[PDB]
Amino acid sequence: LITNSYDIVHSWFIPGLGIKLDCVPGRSTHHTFFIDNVGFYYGQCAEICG
Amino acid sequence: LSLINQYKSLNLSSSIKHNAPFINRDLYVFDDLFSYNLGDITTKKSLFNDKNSFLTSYSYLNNNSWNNNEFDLIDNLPFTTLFDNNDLFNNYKSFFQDSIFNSPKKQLSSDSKQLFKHIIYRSIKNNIIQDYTKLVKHEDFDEYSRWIKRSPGEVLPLRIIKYPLGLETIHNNIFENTNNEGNVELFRLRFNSNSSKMQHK
């Protein structure tokens, strides 16, 4: 996953997956993801987006 | 001050009667040199010279010649009917879609005036047909456009480029470019065609 921000540094935090990718402007953060199970997970922005 | 002695010759016709490659125009016999069935002429008719462009002058004179009509209206050719052959009709429409083949009357008049001025200057050089006001031309190109980009300097007429070597290892053939002769093309010549043309993004 190439995480990137359009306006300000946001954070996608999947709690079930225990992942927290901080998409920041300019930074093309290439982060790996390996889900060892099939499921549906919900999450919110871990960075105050406005 | 710039007009202190800028215009000394004014009667260009007085110069036309002198340097023209023609016989004297005051021949009274020229009034009645020949006899023809002239008919009735209540208005002045100007002799349109040349076998080819004679009537064209009258075409520039008549007002109805500037009447726009749809492609449906112009559905025939002097010896052919464009209604039957749809391909021929499309070809004629394409020929009429070019601006040079469908230029307007204002552009025609501007071109005529420019050509007359150029002819007068290159032949008589009377300096009177020249424009009175001095025009400063500025290339007001706004560099804040992400769609139009000018070229600083210009493209060199010819450039020599060495094609990349070793870029492809698909079949272990390091020679990528090979001309129609089959020889490995190591150098290539890139030539610039249009100096004023821009480049598509």
């Binding site: - | 400063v136 031309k137 500025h138 290339e139 007001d140 190109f141 600083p152 300097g153």
Partner: protein, 122 residues
């Protein structure tokens, strides 16, 4: 376009005048550069004229100073001419300097448009 280096000959006054004239009328001169040149040529004259006027004014008072008022003719003339020459030099130098600096800036802008500067590549 001009040579770059200390050993290179300094730009001549006639060269500066010719460069200004070229920038004022060149067909390859952009609109913004022409506007900058016209604006520079507008305000620059006022500074020199005002400097000359200020010299004429101040130097007049120096001719009636308490000590200068009782000197010989030649000495009084020199003392009076002292301020006027300095202020005339100030005004002329300010006008010419403003003109030449703005002309150099305009020439740099034109070279950026003409791409004639080495190591200037976007």
């Amino acid at each position: 376009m001009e040579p770059f280096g200390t050993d290179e000959r300094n730009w001549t006054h006639e060269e500066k005048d010719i460069i200004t004239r070229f920038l004022k009328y060149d067909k390859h001169v952009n609109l913004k550069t022409a506007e900058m040149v016209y604006s520079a040529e507008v305000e620059s004259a006022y500074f020199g004229k005002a400097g000359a006027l200020a010299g004429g004014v101040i130097s007049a008072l120096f001719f009636n100073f308490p000590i200068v008022r009782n000197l010989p003719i030649i000495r009084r003339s020199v003392i009076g001419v002292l301020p006027f020459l300095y202020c005339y030099t100030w005004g002329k130098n300010t006008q010419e300097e403003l003109r030449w600096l703005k002309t150099f800036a305009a020439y740099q802008r034109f070279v950026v448009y003409h791409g004639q500067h080495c190591k200037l590549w976007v």
